[PDB]
Amino acid sequence: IRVFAIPPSFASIFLTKSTKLTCLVTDLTTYDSVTISWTRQNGEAVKTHTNISESHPNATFSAVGEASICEDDWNSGERFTCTVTHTDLPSPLKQTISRPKGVALHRPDVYLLPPAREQLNLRESATITCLVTGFSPADVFVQWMQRGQPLSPEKYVTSAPMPEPQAPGRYFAHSILTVSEEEWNTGETYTCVVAHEALPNRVTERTVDKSTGK
Amino acid sequence: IRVFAIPPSFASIFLTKSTKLTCLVTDLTTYDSVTISWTRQNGEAVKTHTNISESHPNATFSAVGEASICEDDWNSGERFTCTVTHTDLPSPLKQTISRPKGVALHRPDVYLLPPAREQLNLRESATITCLVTGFSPADVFVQWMQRGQPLSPEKYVTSAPMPEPQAPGRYFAHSILTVSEEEWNTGETYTCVVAHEALPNRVTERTVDKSTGK
Amino acid sequence: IRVFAIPPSFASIFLTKSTKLTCLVTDLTTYDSVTISWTRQNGEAVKTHTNISESHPNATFSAVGEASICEDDWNSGERFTCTVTHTDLPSPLKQTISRPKGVALHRPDVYLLPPAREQLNLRESATITCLVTGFSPADVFVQWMQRGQPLSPEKYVTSAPMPEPQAPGRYFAHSILTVSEEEWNTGETYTCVVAHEALPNRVTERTVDKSTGK
């Protein structure tokens, strides 16, 4: 019997432009009188939370609610409470979560490397990489844009941010975009925008062309 | 109370030229009469396993043992059993592990991405990455060499494998490096050698030079 | 009347992936009850040997036996005996061979020699040589590949390892290839892959490209 709270990751914050915190309950039967609440530091009201999950076949229920919160209120480290009270456990248990402040803020520096000439010979693909290195949080959100229009995640793969061991603590990630050679030849300068929290404007873009690594 | 088995990766198989399988115990107290055995498909004898881990302060114990086995035996899908019998659990529990056969073979194709011209304007460093894309197995090995002698793992980080996005299913990974500039000028072709189970000679090297993008 | 034993070289070891030693018998008539046995240092069992050679027209017989043995056991200097007992020679004679330990291990340095400009003006052929120089053992497996697939041995001949003259003691070899000019223009990088037992990963490849001497 445990209750888990999912913090909104910065990839999740940046994706929908709407931060939200959830509270998933483990090992509790599918009964009624489900108590889900979200209070501020002073216990103010919250937006109504809907879309409760279904009943699991293994005699467990997870009541999932979505609540909007201000970004400045969330980034201030304000404590939120998740009070859960079911028929099995009449004692109200509070799950407290807050912003883990105090981490060093190192912005990523992105060197979007064009493919080597030994790939531009088979004319079957032309994999372009967005090397996103050296950012002190482990939360980066990389996506590619094609002539200003952002591209689908089905076309690129963003790696998990792996640590750069040369730095004391700082991670790097990478993101490749395998595209057709004829498409790479004519047009598609392929801006890769990178979303990080430690950036001055929270977005950086890098640009490439055929006549860049010449 | 669970017992976990970690399979031997081809990366460690190629690096050490000796495959070995482990079986660690979770959430079991530091008691005696620890039963650790490794049985084949026919239950043949196994190499002695030593170097049991220390007692953890949180009242849990993990008995880790190492045992040798032939190369062709492991890749043929022979099932192994991890039988555990502790003081808390007199009932013997078997943790069965085996090679997950059924994956087609595409050999890795390696495109090492060079230093570029605008990178060679600050005169402070050289950054090299070695993209290992397009191979259907997921157990690749990548290591770096300088003038034929291997380079230490303190300077390079192989990304963990991920499926390629444009293809429906095929894996990829890569590895990064950072070095100095004046070293790059005279020497250092910087071969990045990949070791894989699907290449015929099992080793492919891709090399760079000063007269590459010239 | 003599018996000849041929020790297995590393090229035969790397090719068939199973080392085996032979023992040919000279100046003995084509009679039956041919005694051919292979014993280890402790005289353990051996793999059965079949495929006996035909009877020579000059009243001599040579029984050829093939037997597998471990790589490490062969490289550790374990002595093997070739016992022969024919009708003409009832006294058993033992032919002993062993690994000639005592020579240092130096890795080859491969400099594949490219075509020349005036050579590529007749527009009729192109010839490539693969100079493997400076390796201390005398057992080198050199072969050629085209786009990763091995090339047929009808198009190349590996020399015999000859000692270098300027070096006090160090061997060298190379192998030849002749190809067409129009084929060279788009493709055929010609990785000349050399397998030598003193290399760490036991394989080096060197290749040529259109922009090699530009």
Structure tokens at A78: 């304000």
- B199 CB neighbours in chain C (<8 A) are 148
B190 φψ region: left (φ > 0), alpha (ψ -120 to 50), beta (else): left
Number of H helices, E strands in chain C: 3, 14
Of A115, A133, A214, the CB nearest to B111: A115
Which of A114, A127, A213 has the CB atom closest to B133's CB atom? A127
Nearest 5°: phi and psi at A61?
-130, 135
Name residues whose C-beta falls within 8 Å of residue C174's C-beta, 6 or more positions apart in sequence. Answer: C129, C130, C131, C132, C133, C142, C158, C159
CA C178 vs CA C99, C115, C156, C160, C183: distances in Å:
36, 10, 8, 19, 11
Q: How many CA atoms lie within 13 A of B27 on its CB side?
A: 5
* Cβ pair B19, B75 in contact under 8 A: no
Strand partners of residue B80: B97
Give bridge partners of residue A175 from the DSSP assignment: A130, A158
Q: Are C110 and C135 in contact (CB under 8 A)?
A: no
Distance CA C155, CA C146 (A): 12
B31 touches chain A (CB under 8 A): no
- B104 CB-near residues (< 8 Å, 6+ apart): B136
Whether chain B has a CB inside 8 Å of the CB on A108: the answer is no
Question: Residue C13: helix, strand or coil by DSSP?
Answer: helix
Residue showing tokens 């990630």? A173
What angle (nearest 5°) sits at the alpha carbon of residue A174, between those of residues A170 and A180?
Answer: 170
The first and second tokens of residue B43, run together, are 């239950």
SS3 B193: strand
Overall size of chain A counted in residues: 214
Q: Break chain A down into helix, strand, coil percent, rounded to 5.
A: 10, 35, 55
C-alpha angle with apex C186: C184 to C189, nearest 5 degrees? 60
The two tokens of residue A205 are 């873009």
Render the burial of B155-191: b for 16+ CB within 10 Å, e for the rest: ebbbbebbebbbeeebbbbbbbbebeeeebeeebbbb
C-chain CB neighbours of B150 within 8 Å are: 200
| Sequence positions preceding breaks in chain C, C–N over 2.5 Å | none
d(Cα A138, Cα A196) in Å, to the nearest integer?
9
Collapsed DSSP state (helix, strand, coil) of residue C163: strand
Cβ neighbours, 10 Å, residue B104: 9
Query: Alpha-carbon distance A21 to A74, whole Å?
Result: 10
Technique used by the depositors? cryo-EM
Please identify which residue in the block is written with the tokens 């090399």.
B207
Rounded to the nearest 5°, which phi and psi values hold at C167?
Answer: -70, 145
Two tokens, residue C168: 């006090």
For residue A187, the tally of other CB atoms under 10 A from its CB is 11
With CB atoms and an 8 Å threshold, state whether A157 touches B178.
no
Token reading at B15 = 């690096």
Beta bridge partners of B110: B132
User: Which residues, in sequence order, are bridge partners of residue B23?
Assistant: B5
Amino acid, res. A59: A
Task: Report the phi/psi class of residue A57: left, alpha or beta, with left for phi > 0 and alpha for psi in -120 to 50.
Answer: alpha
A95/A38 Cα distance (integer angstroms): 10
Q: Are C206 and C192 in contact (CB under 8 A)?
A: yes
Distance from B41 to chain A by nearest Cα, in Å? 34
Which of chain C's residues have a Cβ under 8 Å away from the Cβ of B192? Answer: none
Judged by DSSP in three states, A127 sits in strand
Q: Rounded to 5 degrees, what are φ and ψ at B23? A: -155, 105
Q: Which residue of A has its CA nearest to B161?
A: A159
The residue count for chain C: 214
Across the interface, whether the CB atoms of B201 and C203 are under 8 A apart is answered yes
From B118, B111, B117, select the one nearest A116 (Cα to Cα): B111
Decide: A81 and A96 in contact? Cβ < 8 Å.
yes
- Indicate the burial class of C101 (C-beta count within 10 angstroms; 0-12, 13-18, 19 or more): exposed
The rounded radius of gyration (Å) of the Cα atoms in chain A is 22
Q: Which two tokens stand for residue B44?
A: 């043949």
Nearest to B213 among A159, A176, A213 (CB): A213
Q: CB count, 10 Å around CB of C44?
A: 8
Q: Are C10 and C140 in contact (CB under 8 A)?
A: yes
Per the CB < 8 A criterion, the answer to whether A148 and A204 are in contact is no
Residues of C in contact with B203 (CB under 8 A): 201-203
What gap in Å lies between CA B53 and CA B24, rounded to an integer?
Answer: 9
Residue C183: which of C116, C112, C101, C126 has the closest Cα? Answer: C126
Residues B127, B120 contacting (CB under 8 angstroms): no
